[model samples]
Target: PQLCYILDAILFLYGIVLTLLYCRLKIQVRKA
Candidate 1:
């Protein structure tokens, strides 16, 4: 149960980070 919670937390953080990076890339492309 504890391991499952830890995995979920990691995934949640990873998703947010991935989204931010994707958005940043898109903005840079548009500016260029």
Candidate 2:
């Protein structure tokens, strides 16, 4: 259970970074 919780936290952070990168790429594409 603890491992699952920790893994979930890491996955959540990874998702946040990916989402930020995706948003940034979209904005750049729009500007271009």
Candidate 3:
């Protein structure tokens, strides 16, 4: 149960990072 909780947190953070990266890429693309 403890492991599951930690994994969930990590996955949530991973999603946020991925979203930010994707937005950055989109901005770069628009600029290009």
Candidate 4:
């Protein structure tokens, strides 16, 4: 999205954001 790239350094930010989101989701589901 254009909004997504408007953050100045979105390529790296997206990678890190998705990585943390994935880890958080995994941790959330780990007990199930």
Candidate 5:
């Protein structure tokens, strides 16, 4: 019950962070 909520929250935040990092890396790669 409570475990599912925690799991989902972690996954949501992880996805957002991953997306942001990917975008930043892509821009840096383009510049270089």
Candidate 6:
């Protein structure tokens, strides 16, 4: 159960980064 919590924290961070990258790409495409 404790290990599961660690995995969740990693996934949460990954999702945040992924979302940020996705938004940045979208903005670039709109500008182009």
Give candidates' CA RMSD values in order: 0.6, 0.7, 0.7, 5.0, 0.8, 0.8
The total of clashing pairs for model 3 equals 0
What C-alpha root-mean-square deviation, in Å, does candidate 5 show against the real structure? 0.8
Candidate 1: residue 30 lDDT (0-100): 98
Q: Write the per-residue lDDT of candidate 4 for residues 1-32, one digit (tens) a residue.
A: 57866776777889999999999999999957
lDDT of 6 at 29: 100
> What local distance difference test score does each model get?
0.99, 0.99, 0.98, 0.86, 0.98, 0.97
Q: How would you encode candidate 3's per-residue C-alpha lDDT over 1-32 as one tens digit per residue?
A: 89999999999999999999999999999999
**lDDT tens readout by residue for model 5, 1-32:** 69999999999999999999999999999989
Candidate 1 accuracy as TM-score: 0.88
Quote each prediction's TM-score: 0.88, 0.82, 0.88, 0.60, 0.82, 0.81
For model 3, give the 10-residue run with minimal summed lDDT. 1-10
Name the runs in model 4 displaced over 4 angstroms: 1-8
TM-score: model 3 vs. ground truth: 0.88
What candidate 6 gets wrong by more than 4 Å, as runs, is none
Error of 1 at 4 (Å): 0.3
Q: Quote model 6's TM-score.
A: 0.81
> Using TM-score as the measure, which candidate wins?
1
lDDT per residue for candidate 1 within 1-32, as digits (tens), equals 89999999999999999999999999999989
Error of 1 at 8 (Å): 0.3
Point out the higher-scoring one by TM-score: 1 or 2.
1
Backbone collisions counted per model? 0, 0, 0, 0, 0, 0
Q: Model 3 residue 28 lDDT?
A: 98
Error of 4 at 27 (Å): 0.2
Tens-digit lDDT track of model 2 for 1-32: 89999999999999999999999999999999
